[PDB]
Amino acid sequence: MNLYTVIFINILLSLTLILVAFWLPQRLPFSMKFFLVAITFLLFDLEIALLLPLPWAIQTIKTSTMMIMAFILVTILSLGLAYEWTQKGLEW
Amino acid sequence: ISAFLKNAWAKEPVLVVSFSVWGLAIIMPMISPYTKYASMINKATPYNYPVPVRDDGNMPDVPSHPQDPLGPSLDWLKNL
Amino acid sequence: PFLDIQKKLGISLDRHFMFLSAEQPYKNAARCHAFEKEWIECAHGIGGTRAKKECKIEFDDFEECLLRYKTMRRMHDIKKQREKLMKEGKYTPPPHHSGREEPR
Amino acid sequence: YPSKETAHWKPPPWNDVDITNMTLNFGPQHPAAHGVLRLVLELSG
Amino acid sequence: RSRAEYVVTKLDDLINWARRSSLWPMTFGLACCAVEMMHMAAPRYDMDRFGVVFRASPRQADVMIVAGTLTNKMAPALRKVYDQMPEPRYVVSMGSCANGGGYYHYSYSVVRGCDRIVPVDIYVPGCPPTAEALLYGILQLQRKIKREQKLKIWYRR
Amino acid sequence: MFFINILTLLVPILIAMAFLTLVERKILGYMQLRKGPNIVGPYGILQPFADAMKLFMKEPMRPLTSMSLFIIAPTLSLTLALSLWVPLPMPHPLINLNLGILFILATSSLSVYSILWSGWASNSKYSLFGALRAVAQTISYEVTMAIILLSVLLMNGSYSLQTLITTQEHMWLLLPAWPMAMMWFISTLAETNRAPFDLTEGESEGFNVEYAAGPFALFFMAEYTNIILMNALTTIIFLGPLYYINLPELYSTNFMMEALLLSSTFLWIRASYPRFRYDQLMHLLWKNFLPLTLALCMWHISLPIFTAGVPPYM
Amino acid sequence: MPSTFFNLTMAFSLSLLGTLMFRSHLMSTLLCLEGMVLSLFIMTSVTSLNSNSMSSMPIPITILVFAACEAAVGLALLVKVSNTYGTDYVQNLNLLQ
Amino acid sequence: MWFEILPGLAIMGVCLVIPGVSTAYIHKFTNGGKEKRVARVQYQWYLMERDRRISGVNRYYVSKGLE
Amino acid sequence: MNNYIFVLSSLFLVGCLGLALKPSPIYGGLGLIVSGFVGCLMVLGFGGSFLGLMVFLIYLGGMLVVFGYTTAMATEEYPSNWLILGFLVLGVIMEVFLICVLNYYDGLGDWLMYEVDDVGVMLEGGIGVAAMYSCATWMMVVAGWSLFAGIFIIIEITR
């Protein structure tokens, strides 16, 4: 709610401006690299999503497993990146 | 091999640092005088109420005032 | 399951978290932790064919700890009653239901 | 058993294989250029 | 005061002040008179100081300065870009090569003036019209706008 | 009251947003040996209001194009940017959100659409090519932008921006984690499409190509507000302004000073550097920065544990 | 909660009818396909949240992580198709008849 | 000289401190002279509402040993 | 406010109906981005916090954005979208039709949050999602294998 109040004022302020604007003055998909980049982006995004709980997981009693897990995730994705840098990938 | 590291430190001076850190983070935890504390310091932090057990008898559990000298202590946390 | 490489190897990568009464993080028991326990310690050693007719009291209850529908029917009925009576003023809400109280 | 409009189908190929680059014109008004260069360029992406 | 006519004038003025203070030009940069405009944009005679932005695309441009010969091949373009600008738009012809035909008036490939292809509001004279002169010309466009009274004609129409 | 607290935190920022363009058209000026705009008003103070009025009055030409993916795009750009100032923790924030930085990261991410929608809406080649490249570096930079924050959080203990005021009561997070500050600063330069990383809508006229008058203004306003917001996030996350609980405004006074200086810095960066190539830009993030960030990300999961410094949740 | 669950479930069926009734461009389908994953993610998260079953929250996300890659594969096939035909219409995918 | 870029900045700064001082005094005036309590975890709300239920109808009102 | 959820739920169905009429590839992407916004809110409406913003952070701008991204590159071509919009409205009132019957014979807020566990400082989500590293570390590994597999799998599909 408190947030709602702010947000609707935010949209109102912008819709007010566009309206004033209008009312006052009375195909080649060559870059599959583009697509490639974008595939990577989510693979990295999804990975981020897996890393996002790490602040709560720091306080986990295990600790050893936490780090062992987190280090494995970061390392395996980075290797994914590495292989993006071995073939003709990430070289647009 | 020195060259494999002297030009790779002159040119490409990012991956070298990058990997170096990857490793240093994979080592310090293994060798450190504090690593053990993390699992303790976080273990100790009391979040959920500590439910008391019935005193059938012959127990070392702190009876009455928790201040009793018996039980766990965090003086390790203190003066850490 | 089909190939129990888990029990054999002794590992438990997939069984520790299959029911609501499994270990919840920070020991925060879920809703119904009481029932499901009563349902599954009942159906342990008794196969399903006989976990389905005699251990029906514990599922009929656990089917209402979680769905919590029979309740709804109760409450919803109660609601309607109040409505009718109230319309004819037969019933009126006390200050408690009028927003007046200070328990501490 | 080929029926009507079923003989239309002819056997699949034995090999299992079947049988301007968004050209844009660089602007003359473009700030780039000295004002009058219409550079037609076919660009694959 | 409240008699609307006064109220209208004041409002118009505000409108004129806004357009006249911030004129965003676009420089087709035909020929050389472009070099004499880049000088205006440059430090001795800062155009920005006056509110004129150094560069702008046609969509966001208030005034088009045609510097240089408008040759017959470029004549269809000039128009296009003039036609691709906003409803309040203006054209400052710069250079004898674009005011009229200039040294190349009798040529077969030069339009004798841009005012044959785009309506022109201020004509800045001189083969390389001096940068100060363009600045004088941009300032006279500012006095031309100040005098415009669009809403008072609406009110009196 | 709460409404008044919405005017403040909005208007004040909008008025400041206007004064940034002015301090951009003068700081770039003197760096280039020119006074900049001083003739309209006194010392150019009325200059930002003047073109705003000129922009809104000029015709918002609707191209012979979508009419919604065209008007939604500037509304979204201004709405997200002004919205992201809602949770910012100057002294104490307006709407304190327990997962605050995820709000800022998510809201930023949504702005990439406005670029995509405006580019598709224009229906001219320059717009589509510009949008596709623009969307590419924005999300490319988002990937390191997010990881750099995750490293921070793990040393802060929570996602709430309010916690960092208590984390940075003894030292700025620049001292530690400076290597990422730089990488946060460069990523903040990319995500606001400012100069070193401003290939879209360059001298090559991307998603303003067909946008004039009121639509131009709204994104426009958005960009500059962002320019501030991201700089302000640098001034909370890495440069922690001194906080005294007894007087909350010296926090905001120093927040004012650091934000203005780092906002001044991207103005100074623009005039000082040529623009990078499209692939040069992605070459930096995926080759130069992402391996640095992912590794330094691991160092920030290790620094806590073996230095027995796991941060206190809450 | 039951009413909301009904809406989400029908959302999944309306998304089901969508993916099982193609029309021209495939990217529409894949897009629809994703509409289901959102509905499943929302429903899984909702019940886990009102069952206070925190041990299961891992799943709501595992569902998304697997679904994202699943979609990555789906789009690469799509790009492969409008590279071999360049029109991405479910219409030309009939060589196998 | 460069003296002149300051006017503009002044109006930016002044417009970036207002918000931080404003939000931090419309809180200390709409919460009875005390910072607005931050309910981050269930327990902080409880005590916050428990307090409401304690006296008057607002939390800032704080009954003391003399009650 | 009551039944805040049903309204939203209704909006989620509307967005799904929009994706189901298979509108133009990117006009509907918006549709998803809309219902993803809606589902983000609902999860955030049942107390969910991290899960709620995750979708907004990942499905919203990560996947969906990449989706349209590709739409522009391929399948950006065009030929009845307004008719789709027209029929969309048709079923919107029809949802009410269904809603009417349900209400016809069976009240949200009666219960949206089932047990509040008011005294608790370790009760939110994200503590559960962080079981990937304690007591549920097999979901984490298999998700990781899928991502690692994805990088290798996709490069051939492109090549």
Ligand SMILES: COC1=C(OC)C(=O)C(CC=C(C)C)=C(C)C1=O
């Ligand atoms: C000489 O050629 C020209 C250019 O490129 C060198 C310009 O950029 C420009 C544009 C410069 C300004 C003053 C906006 C002009 C005018 C031009 O004619």
Ligand code: SF4
């Ligand atoms: S007028 Fe003189 S200067 Fe301007 S273009 Fe013609 S010749 Fe070159």
